[PDB]
Amino acid sequence: VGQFANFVDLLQYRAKLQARKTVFSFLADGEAESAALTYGELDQKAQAIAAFLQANQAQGQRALLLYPPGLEFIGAFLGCLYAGVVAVPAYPPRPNKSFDRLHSIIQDAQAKFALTTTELKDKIADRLEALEGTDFHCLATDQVELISGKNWQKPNISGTDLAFLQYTSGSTGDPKGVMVSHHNLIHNSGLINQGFQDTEASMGVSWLPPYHDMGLIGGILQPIYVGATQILMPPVAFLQRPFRWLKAINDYRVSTSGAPNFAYDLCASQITPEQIRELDLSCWRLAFSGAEPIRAVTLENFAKTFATAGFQKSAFYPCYGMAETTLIVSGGNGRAQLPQEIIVSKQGIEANQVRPAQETTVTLVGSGEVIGDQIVKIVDPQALTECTVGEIGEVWVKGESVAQGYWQKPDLTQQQFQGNVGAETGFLRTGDLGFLQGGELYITGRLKDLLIIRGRNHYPQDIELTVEVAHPALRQGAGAAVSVDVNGEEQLVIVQEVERKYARKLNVAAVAQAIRGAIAAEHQLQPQAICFIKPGSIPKTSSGKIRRHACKAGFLDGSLAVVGEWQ
């Protein structure tokens, strides 16, 4: 299996070797099973959709995938791989919402197709024609007769061929289309398997959205890569009842599952003690966390809350990656049992230095060891000189999982994918800040969101965490710290949602005062302004990540949903 050059050859092999083994079971409500596919049926379905795509002249073209989470999305995605159609997964449109994000992906990808379900096609086909013209074709894939797979013409696929476009979330700017090759997919799956060490006997569960790297490469393709069985549920099933994720782990004796940091906080806060009595989590051997800062207190709160259910903190598997690196770059605790943590000087961090406090301290969790044959360097982002040990700079990645570039952005591709430092060339510039310590990669934040105020660096996630706990009226996870120019000087602005229960009785002056006090004590900063906004209204990506740059744009133009302001 490690001799396959692409996922088409690999799925065809599993379809022969494990034809009747279930590959995916879908729990539509996160509880009761509602559909399933064997390896044999998955391959037959992919061939039938492939043949349907080729007859419709999609080969060599870009095609949006507009599906609910479920098995139809998976068939359409592999169907694109089988047919040679450049798939473009995206969040489906939702009722009473604008198609701005979808049109823009369509515009950027220069896509001539949208692949979807029969139900969705009937609601969006005429709107897509209004936006995209008559030469755009919206096709339904869920009613393709399986016999049509007999007409599939298997393309000559080499590793260097483009497999699909993975669009970034839009956190720091417009979503950019990452050109992911067939070889990227194979190489990274091997890297994931080096770190997780799953086998055919592994069992997984995932609630992650299938449209983006973690849920796609990890939740869909890695089970196929190792020959395992994967249980799936929609993200909305877990977010509305977090117990279902941990109950599924218990019921199927899942060995491998994971999620971003906030999901472990959600489980710790929303699962009752009696619900914990129903869990046996001693089988949960690898609990991965990535896609966001890994917080030491989150790990500890989760480990303590679920200790009586048999969760061991040594199962935590921190990891780091991005769409531009296909998925994973680093993961694991190295030789230690628990995730490595360091206690360093906060003021040092603000000055790009890693050192003990000799001042206040911050605790940072490492995001793993670099996996496999890839190379990671920490580089000064202006001088392009390699940092020495103890110095924070930009994370640069060189390896076979580094994507081919950004779709139709030749200037930006050259800037970010052709990084030169010292006598080195060909590095990917991640746009993340961090450092190396003890073989672990630590990530401190995003370069594009970094705040430089009064001659000092400040990480906005640090300020946002200080603000959200300053008063009961502020909703956790729904704030942004940005800087704005005031007479040529950068100054801090806070955009923060208030809770629904406090929106009608909000004492703006008292809560603003609490926020100013928290920021002064922890960060020695004075906000230029505090903007209180309605619950649910902060600029976010489809996955729910805050768009800090759009918070700044809305503050400066007066388009936020304001309930109160301090200035």
Ligand SMILES: Nc1ncnc2c1ncn2[C@@H]1O[C@H](COP(=O)(O)O)[C@@H](O)[C@H]1O
């Ligand atoms: N372990 C981690 N620690 C901190 N930030 C992370 C981590 N993993 C991923 N991220 C963030 O998520 C970004 C990639 O997002 P995406 O391309 O959507 O996977 C990275 O560039 C980081 O900014």
Ligand SMILES: [Mg+2]
């Ligand atoms: Mg990014």
